[PDB]
Write a protein that binds this ligand. Structure first.
Ligand code: NUK
Length: 126
């Protein structure tokens, strides 16, 4: 069902949460080799989350579930903000700009915390 597909997508998103926090610790510790690997792992997780979210949105549309479509459109827009911040963080790491990396890291944490009440709303709506 689309609901169980959303629970699967929620789990992939929580995997990114866990990997992100491990990455933040490694950054603070200066373990750049670890950070590089965690950033690659996070890119794969976000690409997978984004794809599962698009399939869920498309399915809600085909089902005529107007409220779920509305919430998923709002949620998928915010996801793209996070993706942009994340990609900027990756570039800051490539460039050796720890000041920009720190900034984007906190921004991605706040963008993610803000989008959580809506994430829970979609679970109820599908
Ligand atoms: O795909 C997701 O839901 C997330 C990726 C990341 S990276 C930091 C917080 C999050 S939440």
């Amino acid at each position: 069902s689309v609901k169980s597909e959303y629970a699967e997508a929620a789990a992939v998103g929580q995997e990114a949460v866990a990997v992100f926090n491990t990455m933040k610790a490694a950054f603070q510790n200066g373990d750049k080799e670890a950070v590089a690997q965690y950033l690659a792992r996070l890119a794969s997780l976000y690409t997978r989350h984004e794809e599962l979210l698009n399939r869920i949105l498309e399915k809600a549309r085909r089902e005529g579930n107007k409220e779920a479509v509305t919430l998923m459109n709002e949620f998928t827009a915010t996801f793209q903000t996070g993706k942009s911040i994340f990609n900027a963080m990756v570039a800051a790491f490539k460039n050796g700009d720890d000041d920009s990396f720190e900034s984007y890291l906190q921004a991605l944490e706040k963008v993610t915390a803000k989008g959580e009440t809506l994430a829970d709303q979609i679970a109820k709506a599908l």
